[PDB]
Amino acid sequence: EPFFGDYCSENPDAAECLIYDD
Amino acid sequence: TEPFFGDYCSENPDAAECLIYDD
Amino acid sequence: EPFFGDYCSENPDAAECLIYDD
Amino acid sequence: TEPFFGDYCSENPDAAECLIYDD
Amino acid sequence: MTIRVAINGFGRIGRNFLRCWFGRQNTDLEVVAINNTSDARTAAHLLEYDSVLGRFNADISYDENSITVNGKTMKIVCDRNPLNLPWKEWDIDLVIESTGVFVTAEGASKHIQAGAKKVLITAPGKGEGVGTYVIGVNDSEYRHEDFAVISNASCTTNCLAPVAKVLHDNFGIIKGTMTTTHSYTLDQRILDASHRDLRRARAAAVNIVPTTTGAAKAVALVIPELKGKLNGIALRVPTPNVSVVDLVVQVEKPTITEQVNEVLQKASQTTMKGIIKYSDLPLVSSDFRGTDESSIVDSSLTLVMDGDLVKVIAWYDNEWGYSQRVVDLAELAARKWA
Amino acid sequence: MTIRVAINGFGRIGRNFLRCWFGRQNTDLEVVAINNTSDARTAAHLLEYDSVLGRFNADISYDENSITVNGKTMKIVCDRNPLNLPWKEWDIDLVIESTGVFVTAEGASKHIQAGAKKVLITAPGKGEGVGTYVIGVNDSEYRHEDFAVISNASCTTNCLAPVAKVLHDNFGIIKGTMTTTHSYTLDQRILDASHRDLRRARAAAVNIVPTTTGAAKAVALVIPELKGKLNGIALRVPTPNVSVVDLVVQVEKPTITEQVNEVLQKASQTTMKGIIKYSDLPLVSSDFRGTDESSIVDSSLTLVMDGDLVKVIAWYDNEWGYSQRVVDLAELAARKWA
Amino acid sequence: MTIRVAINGFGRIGRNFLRCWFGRQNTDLEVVAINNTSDARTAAHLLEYDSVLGRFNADISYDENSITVNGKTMKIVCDRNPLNLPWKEWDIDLVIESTGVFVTAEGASKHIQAGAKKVLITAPGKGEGVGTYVIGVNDSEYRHEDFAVISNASCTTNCLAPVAKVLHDNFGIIKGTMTTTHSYTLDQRILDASHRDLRRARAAAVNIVPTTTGAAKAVALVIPELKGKLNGIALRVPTPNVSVVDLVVQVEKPTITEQVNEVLQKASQTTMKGIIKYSDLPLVSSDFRGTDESSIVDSSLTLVMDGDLVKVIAWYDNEWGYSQRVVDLAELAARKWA
Amino acid sequence: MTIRVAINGFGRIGRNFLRCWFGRQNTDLEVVAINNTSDARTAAHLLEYDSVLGRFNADISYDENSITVNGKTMKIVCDRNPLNLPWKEWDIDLVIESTGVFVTAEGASKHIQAGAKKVLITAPGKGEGVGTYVIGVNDSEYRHEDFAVISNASCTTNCLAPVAKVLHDNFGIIKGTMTTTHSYTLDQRILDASHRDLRRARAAAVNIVPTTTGAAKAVALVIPELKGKLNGIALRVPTPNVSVVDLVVQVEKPTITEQVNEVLQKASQTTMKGIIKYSDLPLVSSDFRGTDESSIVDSSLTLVMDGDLVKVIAWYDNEWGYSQRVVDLAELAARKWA
Ligand SMILES: NC(=O)c1ccc[n+]([C@@H]2O[C@H](COP(=O)([O-])OP(=O)(O)OC[C@H]3O[C@@H](n4cnc5c(N)ncnc54)[C@H](O)[C@@H]3O)[C@@H](O)[C@H]2O)c1
Ligand SMILES: NC(=O)c1ccc[n+]([C@@H]2O[C@H](COP(=O)([O-])OP(=O)(O)OC[C@H]3O[C@@H](n4cnc5c(N)ncnc54)[C@H](O)[C@@H]3O)[C@@H](O)[C@H]2O)c1
Ligand SMILES: NC(=O)c1ccc[n+]([C@@H]2O[C@H](COP(=O)([O-])OP(=O)(O)OC[C@H]3O[C@@H](n4cnc5c(N)ncnc54)[C@H](O)[C@@H]3O)[C@@H](O)[C@H]2O)c1
Ligand SMILES: NC(=O)c1ccc[n+]([C@@H]2O[C@H](COP(=O)([O-])OP(=O)(O)OC[C@H]3O[C@@H](n4cnc5c(N)ncnc54)[C@H](O)[C@@H]3O)[C@@H](O)[C@H]2O)c1
Numbered sequence A, C: 001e002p003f004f005g006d007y008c009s010e011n012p013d014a015a016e017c018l019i020y021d022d
Numbered sequence B, D: 001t002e003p004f005f006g007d008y009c010s011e012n013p014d015a016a017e018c019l020i021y022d023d
Numbered sequence E, F, G, H: 001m002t003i004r005v006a007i008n009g010f011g012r013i014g015r016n017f018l019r020c021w022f023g024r025q026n027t028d029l030e031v032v033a034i035n036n037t038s039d040a041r042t043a044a045h046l047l048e049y050d051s052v053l054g055r056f057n058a059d060i061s062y063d064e065n066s067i068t069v070n071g072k073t074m075k076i077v078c079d080r081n082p083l084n085l086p087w088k089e090w091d092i093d094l095v096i097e098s099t100g101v102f103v104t105a106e107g108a109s110k111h112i113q114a115g116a117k118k119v120l121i122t123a124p125g126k127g128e129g130v131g132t133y134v135i136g137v138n139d140s141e142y143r144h145e146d147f148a149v150i151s152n153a154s155c156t157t158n159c160l161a162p163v164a165k166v167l168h169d170n171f172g173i174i175k176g177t178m179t180t181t182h183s184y185t186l187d188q189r190i191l192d193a194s195h196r197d198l199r200r201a202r203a204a205a206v207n208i209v210p211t212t213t214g215a216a217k218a219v220a221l222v223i224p225e226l227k228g229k230l231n232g233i234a235l236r237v238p239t240p241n242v243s244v245v246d247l248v249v250q251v252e253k254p255t256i257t258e259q260v261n262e263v264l265q266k267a268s269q270t271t272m273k274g275i276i277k278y279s280d281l282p283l284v285s286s287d288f289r290g291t292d293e294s295s296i297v298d299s300s301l302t303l304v305m306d307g308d309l310v311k312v313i314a315w316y317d318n319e320w321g322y323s324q325r326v327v328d329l330a331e332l333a334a335r336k337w338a
């Protein structure tokens, strides 16, 4: 989570962060 | 046609709802 | 195999007959 | 361009190799 | 009157044509027989379950050699040779020739030699002696005794003509070119495979595939004045249904974008009512699945380059829209039998 | 007799829910507000036109701050922070959390802080604090005062749990694995693009993309007995909607394929009626679009390898089917509001 | 030192084979003739241009009756009846049977009658009389005089058998089931069209289509031990090439996931070297295009539910991978020609 | 000389641009830094594994904050704000602005305020003060001191201009219209989802989606004489890469189809060598993946309606072809630094 940990924390709906449990 | 996207896209130019590539 | 039995027998490569074991 | 398809398609007009729909 | 009709080729246009029929107000036709390369079980299953149209909401059953839909049973024949079909012995007045194979005046005629009194080709007719009719364009020139073999032209022609007419009457077309971005069809191979046409030989769902077309030149068959004026090509892309045509005509009477749209809209409400649909919404191809009209003008796309170079964009559900026109053409012939 | 509902996240599930609701005869709900990252215009447009569902047959209009469908007006908001939503002042009882970003009790709770009384997450709850329910599996164990934040689990769990139950209650599951061949979803990229999940980063419409799922385990929340027994993976494939689960479980009570389907078939018309559908037709995915049931067993595909090894294949419209279950859950809570 | 080979059926496998052959450093084969339902022009064109493989980097020319690639000329014939092929006069030792229509010893034998000495069917043999071999699994049991008609099994069998072996030789398979998420193939229809198999009749690029397969059992021909233990189904999805198998087997010797991959990984660099590839990267289907191995294990996806329940996922380029194995088998026979 | 270059936006054009570079003869550029919305691990994985280009054959590795390709290490920055980039402290001469977001003269300038001496926008530049160059069309008018922010225009313009030029010089274009059947791109949603542009909001892989374009009008920026003469639209269809443009220009000097083709072919061999490719084979879109030229004229599609209405059809690998031009433009600027 180097980048995506902090990044996805502020923009959880960003194209690079969406994770839908399928 | 900017009752929302004007500001939103100004502040979040890379949002999925804002991307416009000149194909 | 009413139709396809006799039909596919004469035209085994017909669009309606091809069956590739996958 | 009929060294084969001419006769083949004449005799088998419904073959997968012969179908031509005027889209 | 209620003429007896038989369907030769129960494919996309075949089954679509039926469903259009089974869903209409009143009818001067009566589908009594269906010839297909399959058994009745298969024909019944495919008319019900459809990847594009969705499940057919109707009572459907079948037996060793026929299918019944909402009480109506239709005989199921399976002979690849039209000459061997029981047309005469089944008092068949009209045959819907939708196999995609017997599209020449010569091949279609085989239904006549078999007893049918008239044959309707659901595609451009090749050869001499065929009457081509585009509903809303030249259908009023229909005469039962003019031709034994008639054609409903192609789906692109059915989209192109109605619009070419309004643009000609109103502005007079000098010359023009066209391109249709069409959904792939059953004549294309699913994967690279042998084909007399090297482009139709390529994997359909993963390619943009150019093909020659006689839809542009065919428009001349219903609008004589345009003969030798229109030409174009086709590009098949990865969608299973619904197409769009791109028409660029040079006009004699210079105009502006708003004028072109105003007349197209005028017609959609008057003369071309039910044939040309006017759409001012920012929609996409799938939004037109099920549209009955033949041409669905996308007004926001209309363009007029320097007063006399007009470009119109029209969508058309090539399977369903065209089929409505085939049912329309069959009705015309039923209302004028003899 | 009626609770006011707000929809947070007007996406696939958010819009499928609204349409499932409008399609029902009777309801103990009243959708009065929607929060989304768009304007009212975009909301009304995407609700009416859908690439998968087709056009919404309804009277839909809109204005700067609301949309109206068949006489019912719904306020349109656009605040990404739930803590700023006027839930208290709009007397909102239930909030449908379908943004896919507030799946923990903590996050969902922000709606409660904003004044909502209850929140129903349309996804597996993350962390502790949320009550998970699956209609037809443990909906009977619903207590209004148990959790202010509930969850309808994932779409796979809704298709899996109902089948696993009948399989456990009749043959007793010792354990098993499961693979779901799923349609791609909005968390995947259309083309190779950056993503925290290297597989989800790959072009979704041209790849078979594996992803880790929790669905297998999540069943343990509605069927404690299976705690730690099931497990699985997911394979996303190039289709926009409709998925199918492949369940292989080691039964405790040796049986035969005919029995397994006999059981399943029984449930479809009795206990799991309306939840599980029993299909014995040679169908394909598109055939299941718009199917209200949660699990659609393909009987002809059931396998029993050596009396104790069972393999079941069940289809499910991950969007529409699941959304009917969300409406169901919402309705339950409405009928038991405290 | 060299056998003359003829290719019957210049389709996907027929052309993938020819390209796999040209790509190798050394060979004990010489492809001298090709029979197909096309002209030499179509043959040269589809060999050079491929939607999946990309352009064939080679010097390709043709004329009325032959194609030439990098100096080697191959005679082009077009007789659908094998009994009429000039195999005897062209001194043909081995015939690659890849038309998909002569899968029984009876049919394949027609090439022997025509004068060929051996025929290698690129598909599971139908009926009795054919010898089935899977490189790396039982290729060691090859005897030139055993069968004049051999088979390289199906593409799934080639990915499955090699994995099942390592799994049986290390943990001992008690039994298991398998599902293969397969790319669509030429036996499916591009759009809903008539077919003897109601599922194969549905639009392949827009549906998930289940089909019965023999691959699971066929493994029993190269691994007698597993006779009647494995079984499976197939799910065809909208991708033009590359598939993946989902194998779930009840091991006899309880183990752990890390061990299972430790074993598989060992084989990839030792026994099954060149046959099984061990991948521990978060990859997707397209990444495996052009992969020479027969089975590509996705380690991160291996599951061991309760020590004895194992689940393995293995990718395979059903066209290219399988075709390398056909070249391998052909080469074997060449090195052991009697 | 070897100027220092930084890449802002390591997406499709970003990574494609790099691979074009890493595969060239000699270079006057040196990519030293890459800013992207991701970590170095992700940037390295995506440059190697590609759904379209296939695996990158090169030595690739990465560390906590950089990636090395064939011995060359490039720093990896991850700041969404160009103003905060270490351009000054990293002596960055040129920035490749390929984020798709900073395409206005104002936004691109932020790289300058951060230290970069020049910025190259891989897309049409909006606003004033930008120098647009189309290699092979007006690239000889390049002057290092003319503009600090330059643009390589769009991929469609890069296909349109080179052809519009040859057709203008040789026949002089009076007016014209165009339509590009383009592959979908990352600005479109994978499924119906919110978007400021209702058409880009629709499921990309299942729709033909019209979009406005400034590619036609942009041609005027490199061929001043055409200003106010060309206009058109775009239609995005379900293919991940490779596009085709349909140009219809009214000419002053009447001609015939063979003449138009003869000059296009002449140019492809002379003046437009390496920019316009001439193709007389019946190919499909996927056959052009990897084509370096910008315009690939499909001669069999050329048409001339009544001597003065010309229609040309040209393919272009929008990702790879365009990238070669971006690397071309960067080289020009390197060879003329100061
Ligand atoms: N968008 C469209 O699909 C469209 C629109 C307008 C016109 N058309 C035209 O309609 C015709 C058929 O096209 P389609 O899309 O329905 O394709 P299709 O392949 O689904 O339909 C053809 C049908 O004919 C049957 N058939 C073939 N040979 C036969 C024979 N000898 N006897 C009896 N039945 C036979 C096939 O089994 C199939 O059911 C073509 O000429 C085509 O150009 C198609
Ligand atoms: N097959 C399915 O799509 C499916 C099935 C079951 C469950 N789910 C779950 O439902 C959730 C949403 O899935 P979806 O398919 O509808 O995706 P989606 O992207 O279409 O829907 C999300 C919607 O929420 C909006 N949104 C995002 N952040 C927001 C915020 N901060 N405030 C207000 N609105 C916001 C978006 O604009 C969008 O309209 C996920 O958790 C997903 O796992 C999806
Ligand atoms: N993934 C795969 O494609 C795959 C993998 C393993 C095995 N196979 C097997 O290989 C066989 C062929 O499969 P394919 O994918 O190459 O299909 P295909 O349709 O592309 O190839 C068949 C070829 O044989 C030709 N043909 C048909 N009948 C003929 C005849 N009577 N005489 C001469 N040529 C004839 C066709 O014109 C075509 O070129 C099948 O049995 C299939 O199950 C396919
Ligand atoms: N066919 C084509 O793809 C094509 C052809 C010509 C021009 N273009 C143009 O290139 C541009 C990018 O298109 P693309 O296809 O490469 O799309 P893309 O989405 O793959 O690439 C954009 C990249 O920019 C990154 N990014 C976004 N915001 C950022 C920020 N604030 N800072 C740093 N990085 C950021 C993204 O993570 C992504 O890696 C567009 O303007 C487009 O019109 C595309």
Ligand SMILES: [Cu+2]
Binding pocket: D022, D023, E154, E155, E156, E157, E215, E318
């Ligand atoms: Cu048409």
Ligand SMILES: [Cu+2]
Binding pocket: A021, A022, F154, F155, F156, F157, F215, F318
């Ligand atoms: Cu799910």
Ligand SMILES: [Cu+2]
Binding pocket: C021, C022, G154, G155, G156, G157, G215, G318
């Ligand atoms: Cu296989």
Ligand SMILES: [Cu+2]
Binding pocket: B022, B023, H154, H155, H156, H157, H215, H318
């Ligand atoms: Cu472009």
